């Protein structure tokens, strides 16, 4: 029933866990406790098979362990910084008037690790932007930002006032101080049926060919500029980008990362020169 | 809540083997426990094995671990890792042991679980008073011990706080490790952990098993 489905959803009682059946001592030739893990299959033995038990009605649900639950949570994926200036000449430059970032999920460890539990993922996502601006002077003046999404192959701004910011076909979001945090959705977007978290392959056969998932990354870039002109009071602007997956599918589970990440789109785990060999969380006893 | 790409049709979905619906499906996979956590072993494969030998004395201990799923050594297993993303947990656990000696080797072990509040057993005599399994090593190489959900509450914390500790698993010799001539007097045992049908996790949180500095 469609409504019962609604009610269960409201109560978080959709994925219902089995009850424990009562049992008594058994003397047999059957031996649920013995098996061969060599077969590659998890032993099927349950509490009911080994331990005399009382009947227990289970009110536990697995809804919070769903993929939609686990991955469908906002988290920071990037930081973008500006250092504006009253000097019109210095302004308009990258790093001062505008800043760009190549889109990936590999920059922040918490997210990266959660997604790289899977080999392939498919999802739509929400982008939420949190903006801060630290006045360095005695005022903030007027702050208006433009966040432009530039698909792969599209031109990327070189100057704050480039024609590229006209946003003819590129999606753009504007934000003014006092405005609620910007939010928009990016549909699953790829040329494959799923995103590759890992990719065991190359751009080509040559020595210079790229190897990791970087060869599949087709997420484009985000360009952000200060819309307003140079103002008397300089400010430091930091934008944080949060990401939330929706309508999530995932395939082929992987082990979690044991050692610290070193580089974007790489599995390299070896510490920098002079840095002690990477550690894991397994503690000596 | 608009889309930035109106009229954008998604790339068609195709069948890919291995679809995951929930994380419990992962928790139900037997995964190795790094029991032998010594300074000489934590950097290699050997951490996953436990040594068995012909004994002189009787009823000696083989190994001992906590059964708090996000405590050491369990913290680094698949369940421990998934558990570290949740605050609360419940349901029974399954511990499996694989014997890796010779076909000609003979061995009987006692595997036992001790509820909290007493402390680690000091003797096989005490261990036998808890939940236990006597394991006859034979044609079948793997034995499983199920640790029942015994608790004063529906859920325990994943946090390794003694207050809610689930207690201990110990392993003792039942008889001895017995071999014929031309068979090594040594053997190894491999320990695994997996979830039972009633296992659940609740209240998601950031893992404490991974960090970032740069």
């Amino acid at each position: 029933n469609p409504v019962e489905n609604y009610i269960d959803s409201v109560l978080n009682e959709v994925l219902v866990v089995p009850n424990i059946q009562p049992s008594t001592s058994v003397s047999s030739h059957a031996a649920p406790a013995l098996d061969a893990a060599e077969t590659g299959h998890t032993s099927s033995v349950q509490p009911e098979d080994m331990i005399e038990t009382r009947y227990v009605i289970t009110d536990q649900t697995r809804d919070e362990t769903s993929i939609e639950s686990f991955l469908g949570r906002s988290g920071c994926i990037a930081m973008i910084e500006f250092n504006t200036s009253s000097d019109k000449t210095e302004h308009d430059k990258i790093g001062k008037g505008f800043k760009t970032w190549k889109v990936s999920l590999q920059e922040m460890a918490q997210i990266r690790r959660k997604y790289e539990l899977f080999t392939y993922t498919r999802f739509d996502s929400e982008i939420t932007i949190v903006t801060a601006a630290a006045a360095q002077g005695n005022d903030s003046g007027h702050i208006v930002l433009q966040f432009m999404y530039v698909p792969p192959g599209a031109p990327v701004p070189e100057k704050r006032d480039d024609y590229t910011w006209q946003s003819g076909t590129n999606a753009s979001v504007f934000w003014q101080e006092g405005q609620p945090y910007p939010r928009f959705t990016i549909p699953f977007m790829s040329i494959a049926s799923a995103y590759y978290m890992f990719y065991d392959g190359y751009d080509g056969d040559s020595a210079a060919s790229k190897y990791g998932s970087v060869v599949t990354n087709d997420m484009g870039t985000i360009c952000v500029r200060i819309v307003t002109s140079n103002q008397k009071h300089d400010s430091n602007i930091v934008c944080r980008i949060y990401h939330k997956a929706k309508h999530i599918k995932a395939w082929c589970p992987r082990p979690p990362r044991a050692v610290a990440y070193q580089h974007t789109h790489s599995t390299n785990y070896i510490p920098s020169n002079g840095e002690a060999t990477t550690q894991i969380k397994t503690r000596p006893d | 809540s608009p889309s930035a790409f109106p009229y954008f049709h998604p790339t068609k979905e195709i069948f890919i083997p291995g679809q995951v619906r929930n994380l419990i499906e992962m928790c139900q996979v037997d995964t190795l426990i790094p029991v032998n956590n010594t300074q000489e072993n934590v950097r290699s494969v050997n951490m996953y094995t436990v040594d068995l030998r012909t004994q002189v004395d009787l009823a000696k201990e083989v190994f001992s671990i906590p059964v708090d799923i996000a405590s050491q050594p369990l913290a680094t297993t698949l369940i421990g890792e998934l558990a570290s993303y949740y605050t609360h947990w419940t349901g029974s656990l399954r511990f499996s042991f694989m014997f890796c000696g010779s076909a000609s080797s003979t061995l009987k072990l006692l595997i036992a679980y001790t509820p909290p509040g007493v402390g680690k057993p000091k003797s096989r005599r005490e261990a036998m008073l808890g939940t236990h399994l006597v394991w006859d090593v034979g044609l079948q190489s793997t034995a499983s011990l199920v640790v029942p959900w015994v608790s004063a509450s529906h859920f325990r914390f994943t946090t390794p706080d003694t207050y809610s500790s689930a207690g201990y698993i110990t392993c003792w010799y039942q008889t001895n490790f017995v071999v014929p001539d031309s068979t090594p007097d040594n053997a190894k045992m491999v320990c695994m952990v997996s979830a039972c049908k009633d296992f659940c996790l609740r209240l998601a949180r950031d893992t404490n098993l991974h960090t970032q500095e740069g």
Binding site: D63, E68, K246, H247 | P2, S3, P10
Partner: peptide
């Protein structure tokens, strides 16, 4: 089950199954 936007991607979290 109200949808406010034309694009399916703009809908909220999926139901469980």
């Amino acid at each position: 089950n109200i949808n406010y936007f034309k694009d399916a991607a703009s809908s909220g979290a999926s139901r469980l199954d």
